[PDB]
Amino acid sequence: QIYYSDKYDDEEFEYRHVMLPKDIAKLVPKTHLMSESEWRNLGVQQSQGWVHYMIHEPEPHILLFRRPLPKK
Amino acid sequence: QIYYSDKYDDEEFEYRHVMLPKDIAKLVPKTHLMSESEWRNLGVQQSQGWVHYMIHEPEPHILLFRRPLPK
Structure with a gap:
């Protein structure tokens, strides 16, 4: 029932939302x-x-996570 | 977009499925x-x-993946 999305990082963090x-x-x-x-x-x-x-906000059942992108 | 389910596992394999x-x-x-x-x-x-x-076949959008329990 719980679904994790693909990750998507930027020039600092690595994001991923959970549904x-x-x-x-x-x-x-x-x-x-x-x-x-x-x-x-x-x-x-x-x-x-x-x-x-x-x-x-729009969809509170979708948790927003992120973690530090190593090396910089 | 693509979503990955949680993981479960029997005696030898660790299962998961992609949507x-x-x-x-x-x-x-x-x-x-x-x-x-x-x-x-x-x-x-x-x-x-x-x-x-x-x-x-019943659900073409659900891919069933598997992996051997880590060594």
Whole structure:
């Protein structure tokens, strides 16, 4: 049910969004960004270095992650 | 766009499946499994080791991948 998209990085970070089933959208905190412990609890499994950095307003069931692009 | 499911695994293999936009699902061959060269050409980006192991006719937009449990 949980789907991870392809990654897409820029000259600094590496992004990737996760698509949570809308049935679970209510379990996603609305006023604060999640911490690894939190998003890991919704069932999101991924590299520890992924950081929830922003809320996708239009579609809050779509979590927005990103991680530091090595070397610079 | 292309989406990758979560992973599960039996005793020997670690399974996962890719969901392709109906647009590219047109290009998914119906007569044979795809080689790494083939799926990568579609856009499916994954580490080597993951192999298109089974054809799923009822849903041409869902590619079933597999990998041997890491050594």
